[PDB]
Structure 1
Amino acid sequence: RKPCKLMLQVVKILVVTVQLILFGLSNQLVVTFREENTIAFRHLFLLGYSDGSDDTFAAYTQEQLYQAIFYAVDQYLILPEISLGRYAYVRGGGGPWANGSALALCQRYYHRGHVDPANDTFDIDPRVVTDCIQVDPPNLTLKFHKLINVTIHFQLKTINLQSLINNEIPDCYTFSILITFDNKAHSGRIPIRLETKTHIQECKHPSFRLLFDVVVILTCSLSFLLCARSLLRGFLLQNEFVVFFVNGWYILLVTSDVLTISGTVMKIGIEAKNLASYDVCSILLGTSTLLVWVGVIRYLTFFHKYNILIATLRVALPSVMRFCCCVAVIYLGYCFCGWIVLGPYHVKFRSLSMVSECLFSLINGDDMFVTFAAMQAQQGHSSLVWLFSQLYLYSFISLFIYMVLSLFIALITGAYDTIKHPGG
């Protein structure tokens, strides 16, 4: 009945999460399609594309510069002469207007740019100048001190008949591609990278599942308004217990009111702004759905056969909260250590991110024999700190490895005192 209304929320949450794991299957195949489109674009344009090579694509030489300039330039001339598909480079004037290239070959530079590195001085209007060449889809050179960056923006339509395999009509995706040499280091080494966007419009010559997603929205509303109303029972009850864990009899109701509302907001409203807001509101639903599993079990123990371990879940929070506080304080000072040493020879200690990632290496054994063995093997410097790397690392390995089991295990004996309470 009314717990029937709740479990109908739960299994309907199971079913709509079927619908979401379904929709995410559908998008995951489509993102297979997007990612396939992406990898295909990278190799094809890749005059010189190598795997991992992307990690190092840079002209050491100016001839190493201008030739690839010629190379892509030949790409832009004779792409229709060459392509394994059909690509459609229409006017697409960018990125400043006036008028169209299609390949707009631009280049940023200093504006005032006196730089005597032999003199250690400059007179730089740190202003930059940028110049572009228009190359009608059917040669110049520049100062090696002079440039700031350089780019080749052009766009090429293509149409999606592989969706004919997906039983769908050929649609339109235009690839807008800027090719940037980036001279921002100015250090004689210059990476190129290539960017593109894809306009997914339909084909010019141009829903029982969509209705299913909508009806699932309706039942989860039947759920979430049960949640406002059982919370209304609960808030009249808040008014009454004031006037006179578990944790989620109201709280899951608002939070699954939240999960249902976030699925609704991804569907139509923010879904006219599809891509990312989809991803985030789905962020919200999955907490609805993880929540769906947990409270289904919470409705579903039958005491668990009698609530002893459910009693076990609570009281260690009162001490292990202070415990987690102290252990985090340790984690912070050690992250401070990781920030400190990590610069001198490290990638692992490399950011607040990297200090967090070594925290993966602390409790997880993936980081251990690699980091302390390799940093023991000393890329490093300064053999006192060759001593110091092992000393901090083996120092940092030992204490937390000795201690975390006692955090949980002083727990494991004291909820054995709460199981001294409970095991009877």
Structure 2
Amino acid sequence: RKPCKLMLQVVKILVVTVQLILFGLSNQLVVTFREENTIAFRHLFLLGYSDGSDDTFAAYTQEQLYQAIFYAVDQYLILPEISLGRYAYVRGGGGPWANGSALALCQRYYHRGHVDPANDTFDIDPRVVTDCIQVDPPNLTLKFHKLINVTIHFQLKTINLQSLINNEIPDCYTFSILITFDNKAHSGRIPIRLETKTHIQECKHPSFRLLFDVVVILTCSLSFLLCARSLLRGFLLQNEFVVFFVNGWYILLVTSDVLTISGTVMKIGIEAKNLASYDVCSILLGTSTLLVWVGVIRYLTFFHKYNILIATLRVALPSVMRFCCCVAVIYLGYCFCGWIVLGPYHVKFRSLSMVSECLFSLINGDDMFVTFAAMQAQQGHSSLVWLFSQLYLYSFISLFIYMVLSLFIALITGAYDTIKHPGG
């Protein structure tokens, strides 16, 4: 009934989530097509594209420069001539107007770009002059001092005829190519990178599963109306309590309400500004479905045989707040020691993210023999610091390792006392 409604809401948020696992699969296979297209293009225009070489994909010869310039230039010259597929290159003007390349060959560089590092002086009217080449589907050079960045802005239509294997009509995908030579470092190292964007459109010559998803939304609507009715009844009870853990009698209906607001935003309403907000609304659904797990298990305990382990959770968190506080404060001191020591010989201590990453090395066995062995092997320097890196890292491994069993077990021997009260 009403708990059958709660079990139906667990099952129906679970079924909206099954349709979400379905749609997340559907978008995932679409993204398989996307990533296949991505790697395909990365090889494809990639004059010299090696696996992992995109990390190194920076030029050193100036002739190393202009050659790859020619290389893609021929790529665009003869793409229809060479392709294992069919690319659609119509006018495609960008990114400033006027008019169409479709490949816009653009290049930024400072206007008074005056500089003499042998003279210890420079005259930056660094107003970046962008020089652009439009190139119609059927050679020049720039100052190695002078440039800022170089841009190849092309675009290529394609038909998703593999969708014929998904039983779909093939869609229209315009792959929009931004090729970027980036010499903003100007340090003699200039990475090259290629950006592409796919304008998925339907076929020009041109939904029962869609009816099912909209039903999952409207049933989410009914279930949220149920969750709001239950919040009003618990609100009637709390007004009796003010005028007179399980912890989720109301808030779960709310947080379910929040995940539901996020997913319904994903289907239609924010579903026309697509990508990231859908990713977010599905994120909010992730919290709702975790709770669908946790709270459904609450109800289907059916008291869980008195719920001794469910009773296990309570008084510890009363202490656990300050304890996790204390564990953080030592850890923040240790993160400070990492931010101090990380710069001289490390990449693992490279930022606050990396000081977080070494915290994964702390509790997890994966970071230990790697980091504390390799850094003891001394990339290193300044042999007092070779002593210091070992004396820091071996020191950092120990205190938490000994103390952490004692904390989960100080609360764990605390759990034998709330089980000393509670084993009876």
Q: Same fold (TM over 0.5)?
A: yes
Kindly state the Cα deviation for residue 107 of structure 1 after the two structures are TM-superposed.
1.0
Aligned-residue Cα RMSD (Å) equals: 1.1
SS of the aligned residue for 1:72 comes to: helix
Residue 31 of structure 1 corresponds to 31
SS of the aligned residue for 2:230 comes to: helix
Structure 1: distance between partners of 2:84 and 2:298: 57
TM-score normalised by the chain length of structure 2: 0.98
Kindly state the Cα deviation for residue 325 of structure 1 after the two structures are TM-superposed.
0.6
SS of the aligned residue for 1:147 comes to: coil
Residue 275 of structure 1 corresponds to 275
Kindly state the Cα deviation for residue 376 of structure 1 after the two structures are TM-superposed.
0.4
CA deviation profile, 1:333-363 (whole Å, cap 9, x unmatched): 1111111111111111111111111111111
Structure 1: distance between partners of 2:7 and 2:389: 56
Structure 2: distance between partners of 1:226 and 1:174: 45
Structure 2: distance between partners of 1:292 and 1:251: 12
Comparing 256-265 and 312-321, the one that deviates more? 256-265
CA deviation profile, 1:165-220 (whole Å, cap 9, x unmatched): 11111221111112111111111121111111111111111111111111122222
CA deviation profile, 1:216-245 (whole Å, cap 9, x unmatched): 222222221111111111111111100001
SS of the aligned residue for 1:200 comes to: strand
Kindly state the Cα deviation for residue 260 of structure 1 after the two structures are TM-superposed.
2.1
Which residues of structure 2 form unaligned runs of 5+?
none
SS of the aligned residue for 1:394 comes to: helix
Kindly state the Cα deviation for residue 89 of structure 1 after the two structures are TM-superposed.
1.2
CA deviation profile, 1:84-115 (whole Å, cap 9, x unmatched): 11111111111111111122111111211221
Equivalent runs, 1:387-398 vs 2, <5 Å: 387-398=387-398
Residue 67 of structure 2 corresponds to 67
Structure 2: distance between partners of 1:259 and 1:152: 42
Kindly state the Cα deviation for residue 159 of structure 1 after the two structures are TM-superposed.
1.0
Kindly state the Cα deviation for residue 257 of structure 1 after the two structures are TM-superposed.
1.8
Comparing 278-287 and 12-21, the one that deviates more? 12-21
Structure 1: distance between partners of 2:328 and 2:222: 42
Asked if 2 retains the 8 angstrom alpha-carbon contact of 1:315 and 1:415, the reply is: no
Comparing 8-17 and 345-354, the one that deviates more? 8-17
SS of the aligned residue for 1:204 comes to: coil
Asked if 2 retains the 8 angstrom alpha-carbon contact of 1:111 and 1:125, the reply is: yes
Asked if 1 retains the 8 angstrom alpha-carbon contact of 2:109 and 2:126, the reply is: no
SS of the aligned residue for 2:246 comes to: coil
Kindly state the Cα deviation for residue 261 of structure 1 after the two structures are TM-superposed.
2.1
Asked if 1 retains the 8 angstrom alpha-carbon contact of 2:152 and 2:177, the reply is: yes
CA deviation profile, 1:319-340 (whole Å, cap 9, x unmatched): 1211111110011111111111
Structure 2: distance between partners of 1:219 and 1:176: 39
Asked if 2 retains the 8 angstrom alpha-carbon contact of 1:339 and 1:355, the reply is: yes
SS of the aligned residue for 1:19 comes to: helix
Asked if 2 retains the 8 angstrom alpha-carbon contact of 1:179 and 1:194, the reply is: yes
Equivalent runs, 1:280-291 vs 2, <5 Å: 280-291=280-291
Kindly state the Cα deviation for residue 12 of structure 1 after the two structures are TM-superposed.
1.9
Asked if 2 retains the 8 angstrom alpha-carbon contact of 1:92 and 1:102, the reply is: yes
Residue 138 of structure 2 corresponds to 138
Kindly state the Cα deviation for residue 14 of structure 1 after the two structures are TM-superposed.
2.3
SS of the aligned residue for 1:145 comes to: coil
Asked if 2 retains the 8 angstrom alpha-carbon contact of 1:320 and 1:407, the reply is: no
Comparing 361-370 and 5-14, the one that deviates more? 5-14
CA deviation profile, 1:118-143 (whole Å, cap 9, x unmatched): 11111111212121222222111111
Residue 3 of structure 2 corresponds to 3
Kindly state the Cα deviation for residue 16 of structure 1 after the two structures are TM-superposed.
2.2
- Confirm whether residue 230 of structure 1 aligns to residue 246 of structure 2: no
Structure 2: distance between partners of 1:154 and 1:14: 44
SS of the aligned residue for 1:125 comes to: strand
Asked if 2 retains the 8 angstrom alpha-carbon contact of 1:153 and 1:176, the reply is: yes
Equivalent runs, 1:5-404 vs 2, <5 Å: 5-404=5-404
Structure 1: distance between partners of 2:73 and 2:263: 47
Kindly state the Cα deviation for residue 63 of structure 1 after the two structures are TM-superposed.
0.5
TM-score normalised by the chain length of structure 1: 0.98
Comparing 313-322 and 217-226, the one that deviates more? 217-226
Q: How many percent identity over aligned positions?
A: 100
